[PDB]
Write a protein that binds this ligand. Structure first.
Ligand code: IHP
Lengths: 45, 67, 13, 134, 73, 49
């Protein structure tokens, strides 16, 4: 049951349609920023 | 590509006007037309079948029509 | 203006 | 006096005058062209390749808080993270310098400053820029 | 809606039914008229140093990344 | 106006305790990357600010 082919770029017959028919991390950043905070603490110490 | 033959005719001019005019300088009067005549006859030798095919296609478009 | 002429003097040679 | 002498384009010369001063300074070293005792001089040119495309904003923020007020550094690391629209596509530029920013010269020098300190080291850089009072 | 996709092709039955006109083309001139036949201490001040294939996707390939780093500078 | 207020697919509702306690951890982790935190939360950037 193929959907009825609604897209964003070309509306050929000028139909308006229901609006919804138009339209996590690695650990390493925790490894960087924490370490940078650590180094910043050492700098301030 | 007639320019080829035209250049050759100009080039034959540039030879013949400085072997016809050794003691004559500059001016009209030269009429040794033989090799430029040969060059244009060789051009016609080349474009007899060219014009046969071109005008055959044109005349059959005039009578028979476009395929 | 004084500072800019000293800066152009340092920058030139 | 943040940026040392070796960082270019400095405001003191046009790039042909940069080339001329560079050739003069190559000549004006003490016994540079002497090969009598068997010396050797090496001149190396290389591109710091993709330097504006691999700047990490955590590292960049911690580098920029050393030199400016941290409101400015938060502004800079939040300005280099905007959406890049185009005709069709769009993406959040999560890291890497957008060179088209007006102040993106400064970051491209300042981060480049870090690479100089990682190439010259500390001691020779202290030799090159001289003391701070002069 | 004056421009449309193709539903089916112009069939060669429609070209076989037409009577031909003799238009001697520039390329159907006789050429290659023979068929060939076969037989039958100074570096210890710094912070870094030595003292201290193929994938099928073309956009994700190695050559395409070499290309884009070659041609966007 | 579309991608920040009128697109219904991204969430404007009030955040849970989990989302606040992970957004503080992100704002420590990714300091001033508010479009990046917006992509991670699938939420509007200025709303998360
Ligand atoms: O302009 P010039 O460099 O002085 O050459 C001319 C020119 O020959 P080009 O075609 O090579 O330029 C004339 O040709 P046209 O101007 O007629 O095209 C030609 O005169 P004719 O063709 O009428 O014979 C004449 O030759 P001349 O005056 O000796 O007859 C010839 O001068 P040069 O002999 O000094 O090259």
């Amino acid at each position: 049951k193929i959907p009825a082919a609604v897209s964003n770029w070309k509306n050929p017959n000028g139909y308006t349609v229901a609006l919804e028919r138009r339209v996590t991390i690695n650990d390493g950043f925790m490894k960087l920023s924490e370490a940078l905070e650590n180094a910043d603490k050492k700098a301030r110490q | 590509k007639v320019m080829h033959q035209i250049r050759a005719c100009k080039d034959l001019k540039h030879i013949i006007y400085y072997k016809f005019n050794k003691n004559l300088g500059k001016g009209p009067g030269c009429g040794f037309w033989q090799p430029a005549w040969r060059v244009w006859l060789n051009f016609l030798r080349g474009t007899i079948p060219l014009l046969e095919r071109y005008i055959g296609n044109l005349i059959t478009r005039q009578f028979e029509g476009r395929s | 203006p004084e500072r800019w002429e000293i800066r152009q003097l340092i920058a030139s040679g | 006096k943040l940026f040392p002498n070796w960082i270019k384009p400095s405001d003191s010369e046009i790039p042909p005058l940069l080339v001329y001063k560079w050739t003069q300074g190559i000549n004006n070293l003490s016994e540079i062209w002497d090969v009598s005792r068997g010396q050797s001089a090496v001149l190396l040119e290389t591109t710091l390749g993709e330097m504006a495309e691999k700047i990490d904003f955590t590292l960049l923020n911690r580098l920029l808080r050393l030199i400016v007020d941290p409101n400015i550094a938060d502004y800079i690391t939040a300005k280099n993270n905007v959406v890049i629209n185009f005709k069709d596509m769009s993406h959040v530029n999560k890291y890497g310098l957008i060179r088209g920013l007006k102040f993106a010269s400064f970051i491209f020098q300042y981060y480049g400053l870090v690479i100089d300190l990682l190439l010259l080291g500390q001691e020779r850089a202290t030799d090159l820029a001289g003391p701070a009072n002069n | 809606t004056s421009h449309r996709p193709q539903l089916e092709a112009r069939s060669g039955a429609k070209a076989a039914a037409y009577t031909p006109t003799g238009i001697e083309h520039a390329r159907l001139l006789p050429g290659h008229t023979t068929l060939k036949y076969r037989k039958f201490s100074w570096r210890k001040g710094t912070a870094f140093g030595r003292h201290k294939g193929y994938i099928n996707d073309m956009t994700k390939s190695e050559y395409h990344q070499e290309f884009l780093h070659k041609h966007v500078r | 106006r579309w991608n920040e207020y009128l697109n219904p697919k991204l969430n404007f509702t009030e955040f849970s305790k989990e989302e606040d306690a992970q957004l503080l951890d992100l704002a420590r982790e990714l300091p001033n990357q508010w479009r990046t935190i917006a992509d991670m939360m699938a939420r509007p950037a200025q709303v998360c600010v």
